[PDB]
Amino acid sequence: SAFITFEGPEGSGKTTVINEVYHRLVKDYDVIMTREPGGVPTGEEIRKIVLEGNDMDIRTEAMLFAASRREHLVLKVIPALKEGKVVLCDRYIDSSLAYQGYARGIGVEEVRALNEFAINGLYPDLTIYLNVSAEVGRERIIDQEDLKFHEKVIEGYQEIIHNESQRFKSVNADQPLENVVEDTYQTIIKYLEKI
Amino acid sequence: SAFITFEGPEGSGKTTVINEVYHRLVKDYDVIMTREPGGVPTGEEIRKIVLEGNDMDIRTEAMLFAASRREHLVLKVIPALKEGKVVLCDRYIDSSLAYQGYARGIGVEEVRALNEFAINGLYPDLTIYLNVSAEVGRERDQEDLKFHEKVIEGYQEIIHNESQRFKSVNADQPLENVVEDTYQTIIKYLEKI
Numbered sequence: 001s002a003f004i005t006f007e008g009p010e011g012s013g014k015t016t017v018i019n020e021v022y023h024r025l026v027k028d029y030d031v032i033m034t035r036e037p038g039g040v041p042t043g044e045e046i047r048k049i050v051l052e053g054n055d056m057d058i059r060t061e062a063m064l065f066a067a068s069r070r071e072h073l074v075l076k077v078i079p080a081l082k083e084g085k086v087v088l089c090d091r092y093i094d095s096s097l098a099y100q101g102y103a104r105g106i107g108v109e110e111v112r113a114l115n116e117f118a119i120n121g122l123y124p125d126l127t128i129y130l131n132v133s134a135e136v137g138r139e140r141i142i143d144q145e146d147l148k149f150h151e152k153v154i155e156g157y158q159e160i161i162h163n164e165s166q167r168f169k170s171v172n173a174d175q176p177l178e179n180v181v182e183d184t185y186q187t188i189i190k191y192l193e194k195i
Numbered sequence: 196s197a198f199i200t201f202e203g204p205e206g207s208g209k210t211t212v213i214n215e216v217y218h219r220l221v222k223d224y225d226v227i228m229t230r231e232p233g234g235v236p237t238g239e240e241i242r243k244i245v246l247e248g249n250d251m252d253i254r255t256e257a258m259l260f261a262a263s264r265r266e267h268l269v270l271k272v273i274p275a276l277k278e279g280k281v282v283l284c285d286r287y288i289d290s291s292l293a294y295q296g297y298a299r300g301i302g303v304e305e306v307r308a309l310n311e312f313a314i315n316g317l318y319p320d321l322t323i324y325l326n327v328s329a330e331v332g333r334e335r336d337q338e339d340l341k342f343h344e345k346v347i348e349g350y351q352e353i354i355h356n357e358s359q360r361f362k363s364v365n366a367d368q369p370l371e372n373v374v375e376d377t378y379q380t381i382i383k384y385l386e387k388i
């Protein structure tokens with residue numbers, strides 16, 4: 001079994017990369033692809049609260065992402081890993097660390113303590129970071145507040161990866177998506193075949 | 196202003212005590228009574244998930260009580276404290292410590308760390324613990340009785356590590372005496388500013 005998460009800002013082609021990597025891995029491994037809330041009822045109700053929120057307090061928002069993370073983890077991820085599957089998860093703890101923690105300014109260490117209560121030791125075995133430059137990312141997406149937030153998410157991810165190098169594998173997401181797909185696929189197959 | 200919370204297991208007389216204390220305090224203070232979620236829209240939505248739910252993971256449950264707590268604190272408690280109000284709050288951080296942390300077996304320090312993220316340093320000015328014995332509290336199935344006992348054991352462990360804001364009121368005595376001891380404790384804190 002393997003728990004592999006995918007991280008990156010918007011415009012990193014992450015969703016495109018995970019779907020293509022999944023289509024290729026299914027030919028050789030027992031694997032599922034998922035994301036939060038991913039159909040878990042309580043998680044879906046939590047998502048409705050997040051999306052209906054008008055200037056919601058950032059700590060309440062972080063706790064709701066963490067509660068959706070726990071429900072998804074318990075009802076989808078853990079049973080799949082128990083069945084010996086490879087689980088590909090599009091966004092996990094690092095997304096709360098970069099977004100709520102760094103970019104929103106709650107602090108990475110505080111949001112990490114919250115998410116450690118939620119995941120209870122279940123950190124990914126490997127995290128694929130789609131390292132896109134702010135300028136390339138922006139072009140894949142297409143005001144000043146949105147550009148500044150996108151750059152702060154990217155800075156956040158750099159800070160997280162600097163302190164946890166062993167868990168992460170950075171993939172150059174500035175290259176064409178065919179190459180991003182290929183480098184990500186190779187990184188995963190290398191980790192999996194070493195187990 | 197003052198942020199006063201009330202803690203205790205079931206059968207402690209808490210709802211009666213808060214209401215009677217409110218009626219006495221309102222003569223000298225601008226006081227409000229509240230409880231989480233307390234009408235805060237996001238908190239009300241969260242409460243529906245906790246109630247209209249089935250066999251929910253205990254950690255997920257703890258995070259939802261913590262999220263409702265933050266919403267009620269930021270949109271209701273803090274604005275009332277800014278107005279100079281005495282806020283009488285029925286259950287706060289210590290209920291999560293006793294119920295989620297001790298009784299449900301998540302762990303007290305793990306639940307404390309979650310709730311410190313939610314309250315972000317806003318601990319009560321005073322906390323009234325309505326100290327009722329498991330036997331007296333039971334009178335006021337086996338699983339529910341063991342859980343009620345676990346809750347009291349939980350509350351006992353919290354005060355064994357905290358004494359400043361914590362004020363234990365003997366809740367085994369008749370309700371008139373419980374109200375008097377509570378009111379007198381609050382007024383002694385309030386008069387000392």
Ligand SMILES: Cc1cn([C@H]2CCCN([C@H](CC(C)C)c3ccc(C(=O)O)c(Oc4cccc(Cl)c4)c3F)C2)c(=O)[nH]c1=O
Pocket residue numbers: 010036037043046047050051064065068091092095096099100
């Ligand atoms: C997993 C995760 C994602 N994000 C971001 C990633 C980029 C997109 N955004 C938006 C934020 C909203 C407020 C505009 C987003 C986009 C789509 C959905 C969507 O699902 O349509 C969404 O709802 C979710 C997604 C995951 C979990 C939950 Cl509880 C809600 C969402 F928050 C979430 C965080 O900030 N923290 C996290 O832990």
Ligand SMILES: Cc1cn([C@H]2CCCN([C@H](CC(C)C)c3ccc(C(=O)O)c(Oc4cccc(Cl)c4)c3F)C2)c(=O)[nH]c1=O
Pocket residue numbers: 231232238241242245246259260261263286287290291294295
């Ligand atoms: C504040 C608090 C209370 N409780 C208990 C105290 C005793 C009553 N119970 C029940 C549990 C449910 C699952 C049957 C309870 C009873 C009534 C309501 C009710 O309000 O009808 C309720 O809903 C709430 C209350 C506070 C916050 C939230 Cl999110 C939901 C509730 F959880 C909550 C906890 O376990 N943790 C806390 O942080």
